[PDB]
C-alpha cells in the first residue's frame, strides 16, 4: 500500500506504443499471421501497469505488468482475449503469474479506442500490406 509504480518511458525495441494508453504496447516478436486465412493475426498485447499486483503466491511479489494474448480478424474486427500472465518486470518477462482461471471474450472492436487503433496497425501491416 500503495506500492506506485513509475511504468518506463522508454520503449523496448520490439514493442509498439498505442496513442491513447502510452503503457500500452503490441509485441511486435510474437505477431503471427493464420496460415489457413490471412486476415486472422495473432499477437500479444503488453501492459507496463501503475500499481503492483500481488498475484503471486508469495505475497512479498507483485507483478509489474501484463502479457495477454490476442487473436484479431482483420475482416470484421472481432477480437479475441485469449489467454493474460503477469510478470514481475515491465515488459511481460520475468517471474510469471497466470489467473486460477482465464477469462475469454471476443469484442467487435469500435473507432476511437486503444484495441481498434492497435488494429488499424495490425491489419494495415499484416493481414494486408496496406490500409483502405
Not at 39 to 51: G, K, T, W
Request: contains cysteine; charged residues 25%; aromatic residues 12%.
Amino acid at each position: 500500500n500503495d506500492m506506485k509504480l513509475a511504468p518506463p518511458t522508454d520503449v523496448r525495441s520490439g514493442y509498439i506504443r498505442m496513442v491513447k494508453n502510452v503503457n500500452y504496447y503490441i509485441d511486435s516478436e510474437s505477431i503471427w499471421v493464420d496460415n489457413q486465412e490471412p486476415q486472422i493475426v495473432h499477437f500479444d498485447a503488453v501492459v507496463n501497469m501503475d500499481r503492483g499486483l500481488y498475484v503471486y503466491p508469495e505475497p512479498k511479489r507483485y507483478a509489474r505488468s501484463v502479457r495477454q494474448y490476442k487473436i484479431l480478424n482483420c475482416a470484421n474486427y472481432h477480437l479475441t482475449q485469449v489467454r493474460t500472465d503477469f510478470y514481475d518486470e515491465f515488459w511481460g518477462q520475468g517471474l510469471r503469474a497466470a489467473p486460477k482461471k482465464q477469462k475469454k471474450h471476443t469484442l467487435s472492436l469500435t473507432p476511437d479506442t486503444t484495441l481498434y487503433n492497435a488494429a488499424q496497425i495490425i491489419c494495415a501491416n499484416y493481414g494486408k500490406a496496406f490500409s483502405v
